[PDB]
Amino acid sequence: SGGRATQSPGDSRRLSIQRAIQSLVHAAQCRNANCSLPSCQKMKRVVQHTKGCKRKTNGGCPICKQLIALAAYHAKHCQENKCPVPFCLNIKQKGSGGSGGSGGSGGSGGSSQKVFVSKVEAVIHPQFLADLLSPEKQRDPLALIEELEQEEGLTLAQLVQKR
Ligand SMILES: [Zn+2]
Ligand SMILES: [Zn+2]
Ligand SMILES: [Zn+2]
Numbered sequence: 001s002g003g004r005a006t007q008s009p010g011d012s013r014r015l016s017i018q019r020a021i022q023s024l025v026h027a028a029q030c031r032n033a034n035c036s037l038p039s040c041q042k043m044k045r046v047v048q049h050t051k052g053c054k055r056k057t058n059g060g061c062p063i064c065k066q067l068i069a070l071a072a073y074h075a076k077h078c079q080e081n082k083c084p085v086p087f088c089l090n091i092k093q094k095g096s097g098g099s100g101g102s103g104g105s106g107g108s109g110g111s112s113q114k115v116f117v118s119k120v121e122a123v124i125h126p127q128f129l130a131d132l133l134s135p136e137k138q139r140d141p142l143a144l145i146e147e148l149e150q151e152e153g154l155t156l157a158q159l160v161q162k163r
Contacts (some may be wrong), residue, residue: 007106010116013126014073014102016109020076020129024067029084039132046132046141062148063141065122072120073101085143095120114156122150 027043029155
């Protein structure tokens with residue numbers, strides 16, 4: 001009757017995905033000016049990126065990929081067709097798939113963004129997730145982002161060529 005979750009290194013970072021996803025939903029429908037929360041302000045930036053973006057799904061910007069990842073992962077745990085979450089909407093119209101995600105409640109995340117099924121999660125780069133969750137102020141996701149697209153050249157590409 002549900003359940004069935006194991007706390008892998010991935011789980012913890014998928015939980016950071018789900019946690020940034022919790023952020024996502026919030027900034028997606030936050031219209032309270034009195035609210036100036038850390039995860040909210042940083043995500044207000046990251047969300048506003050998703051809309052004012054052009055290289056969105058072209059694969060250039062890291063955000064929109066990890067945001068269609070968040071919004072998708074989120075969309076799996078979402079039952080709203082008229083959702084506030086941006087890419088959740090286009091998920092229901094384009095990104096069709098099953099349910100699931102993670103939920104083992106692990107806290108020992110690690111480099112597991114290769115072995116896993118990279119169907120949803122493109123360049124989520126949990127550091128970005130972590131920074132949203134961080135009470136710190138000048139710890140912006142979009143700052144990480146430009147860093148992330150730089151590091152998008154490293155790993156997976158590492159020793160990938162073969163015969
Ligand atoms: Zn807010
Ligand atoms: Zn973008
Ligand atoms: Zn949604």
